[PDB]
Curated annotation (Swiss-Prot):
Residues 1-105 form the CV ZBD domain. LRR repeats lie at residues 208-228. Changing residue 372 to C: In strain: Omicron/BA.2, Omicron/BA.2.12.1, Omicron/BA.2.75, Omicron/BA.4, Omicron/BA.5, Omicron/BQ.1.1, Omicron/XBB.1.5, Omicron/EG.5.1. It is found in: Host endoplasmic reticulum-Golgi intermediate compartment. Plays a role in viral RNA synthesis. Multi-functional protein with a zinc-binding domain in N-terminus displaying RNA and DNA duplex-unwinding activities with 5' to 3' polarity. Activity of helicase is dependent on magnesium. Binds to host TBK1 and inhibits TBK1 phosphorylation; the interaction with TBK1 decreases IRF3 phosphorylation, which leads to reduced IFN-beta production. Zn(2+) 11 binds at residues 5, 8, 26, 29. The chain holds residues 5325 to 5916 of 7096 of the full protein. It comes from the Viruses. Zn(2+) 12 binds at residues 16, 19, 33, 39. Residues 419-572 form the (+)RNA virus helicase C-terminal domain. This is Helicase nsp13. Zn(2+) 13 binds at residues 50, 55, 72, 75.
Length: 572
């Protein structure tokens, strides 16, 4: 085992045995690690364990080198040097933050704060460790064996005793048994297979744990500033449609990487596709974490870019329905649209990474490892929703801690900012501009006079932990009878269980705030449901109200966010 130290890069044979990722640690840092943490197992070619027969001493501080072997204080020969002395551990080729990443359980916010404020090699170590911990936690949950079938979209399940039950929402995807991946929604439950299969009684579902691979490439490559556009060739004949972004497309060619903060409806997809029309011969790889964000880029490319040079990359193990209008899996097309987890090993003139608030440092590193590009563009908004951190239960994660790109956008500011929201009525724009954008987001549309807010706490019931507020759905029902124009509205709430009750009572299409991100609707009916930290999250609130093009009805629980809404108040 010959490699480089994760804290100093000094070559060493040593690796920490108690670290779940086995990081290579140099003699000066390996000591600093074992002497300050519960981690005492050290691994070089042979473990630093006692060579005496039947001896169970593995702590490196209680061990010595006796000639060419290792022994504890009870078996060491007279001529034996301690392995731990003078700030070093004997190894070939002869920090507080590394200890904290190495030993935390990833349940606190301060753990993620650290995984983003540390050095670049420690950011990769933190993302490798966190992902390995997240996967092992999936194994702790119990197996759900099918006790019976009801119909084509409903079933009943038997859970494992002793092992806790994972929460039922489309977030947690099970693997059927190999009957394909399956999703559930709340003893009557709604079953949904990625593959159409006549539900087998006896078969079981298990949360499939992917193997965490090691990170090699940084989350952000080292920045390079140029005095000319590099490797890219602009057009002089550029349609007036994209004239607004000409100066920013040039900024893109005069830097190795660039950040774009685009509040909702400010033109991110337009900017991303227009960059292809500006550097017309440049091969562009369009990437995002979700299939929906890649599909949304495909919809904009279909309108402006030639359908022949466009390819949508679909992983052979297809899970959800995606874009069907490009030639599929043709890696060598000029315009390649693909999710981070399915990226092939290829090079590009430009790489566009959209919905950057949803990326983790693990995703950021994977992109830098599978794609070698002249220019990298990071598009998103740190005021929108981040990736769900499953293990995180204590504390709240601020935008500057979502990933490396968000960290930059929230501290030094973004390289480019789309300041005019063209989607929302002014009431909505004026609310989110003051809430999350320090009054720098401006309204293109006029006030629609179709933005209403109602202060109604109702009654909070729970479907395990996911909340329901029937009096809030009852208030929406009464409003709908008086304003039937709102019959075509999308119902939005922070909880899938609230959305299940509202789908049956109201008959409106349903969307959680988290699944609505990147989408727009003429009318939106939002019920806050609870007054929790989840439902009062300003990034989730910002996404919730910025889905509307024409009108919105907000039934609120929080007096703070109700007062911040610059909407017409209703009564009943
Ligand atoms: Zn070191
Ligand atoms: Zn360790
Ligand atoms: Zn011994």
């Amino acid at each position: 085992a010959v490699g480089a130290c994760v804290l100093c890069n000094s070559q060493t044979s040593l690796r920490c045995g108690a670290c779940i990722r086995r990081p290579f640690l140099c003699c000066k840092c390996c000591y600093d690690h074992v002497i300050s943490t519960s981690h005492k197992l050290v691994l070089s070619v042979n473990p630093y364990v006692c060579n005496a027969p039947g001896c169970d001493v593995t702590d490196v501080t209680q061990l010595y080198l006796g000639g060419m072997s290792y022994y504890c204080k009870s078996h060491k020969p007279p001529i034996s040097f301690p392995l731990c002395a003078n700030g070093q551990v004997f190894g070939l080729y002869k920090v507080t933050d590394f200890n904290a990443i190495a030993t935390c359980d990833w349940t606190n916010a301060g753990d993620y704060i650290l995984a983003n404020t540390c050095t670049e090699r420690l950011k990769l170590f933190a993302a490798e460790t966190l992902k390995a911990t997240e996967e092992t936690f999936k194994l702790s949950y119990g197996i759900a064996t099918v006790r019976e079938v009801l119909s084509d979209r409903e079933l009943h399940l038997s859970w494992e005793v002793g092992k806790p039950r994972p929460p039922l929402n489309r977030n947690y995807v099970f693997t059927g048994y190999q009957i394909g991946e399956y999703t559930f929604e709340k003893d009557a439950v709604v079953y949904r297979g990625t593959t159409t299969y006549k539900l087998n009684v006896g078969d079981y579902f298990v949360l499939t744990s992917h193997t965490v691979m090691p990170l090699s490439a940084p989350t952000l490559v080292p920045q390079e500033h140029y005095v000319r556009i590099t490797g890219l060739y602009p057009t002089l004949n550029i349609s007036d449609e994209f004239s607004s972004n000409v100066a920013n497309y040039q900024k893109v060619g005069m830097q190795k990487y660039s950040t774009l903060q685009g509040p909702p409806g400010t033109g991110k997809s337009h900017f991303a596709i227009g960059l292809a029309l500006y550097y017309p011969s440049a091969r562009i790889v369009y990437t995002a974490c979700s299939h929906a964000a890649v599909d949304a880029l495909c919809e904009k490319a279909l309108k402006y870019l030639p359908i022949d040079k466009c390819s949508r990359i679909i992983p052979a193990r297809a899970r959800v329905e995606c874009f069907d209008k490009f030639k599929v899996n043709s890696t060598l097309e000029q315009y390649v649209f693909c999710t981070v987890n399915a990226l092939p090993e290829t090079t590009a003139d430009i790489v566009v990474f959209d919905e950057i608030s949803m990326a983790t440092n693990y995703d950021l590193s994977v992109v830098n490892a599978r794609l070698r590009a002249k220019h990298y563009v990071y598009i998103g908004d740190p005021a929108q929703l981040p990736a769900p951190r499953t293990l995180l239960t204590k504390g709240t994660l601020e935008p500057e801690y979502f990933n490396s790109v968000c960290r930059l956008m929230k501290t030094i500011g973004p390289d480019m900012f789309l300041g005019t929201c063209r989607r929302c009525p002014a009431e909505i724009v004026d609310t989110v501009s003051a809430l999350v954008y320090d009054n720098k987001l401006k309204a293109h549309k006029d006030k629609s006079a179709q933005c209403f807010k109602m202060f109604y706490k109702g009654v909070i019931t729970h479907d395990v932990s996911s909340a329901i507020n029937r009096p809030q759905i009852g208030v929406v029902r009464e409003f709908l009878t008086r304003n039937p124009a709102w019959r075509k509205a999308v119902f939005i709430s922070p909880y899938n269980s609230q959305n299940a009750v509202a789908s049956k009572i109201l008959g409106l299409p349903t969307q959680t705030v988290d699944s609505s991100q990147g989408s727009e609707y003429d009318y939106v009916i939002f019920t806050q449901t609870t007054e929790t930290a989840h439902s009062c999250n300003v990034n989730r609130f910002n996404v919730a109200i910025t889905r509307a093009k024409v009108g919105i009805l907000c039934i609120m629980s929080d007096r703070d966010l109700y007062d911040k809404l610059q909407f017409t108040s209703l009564e009943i």
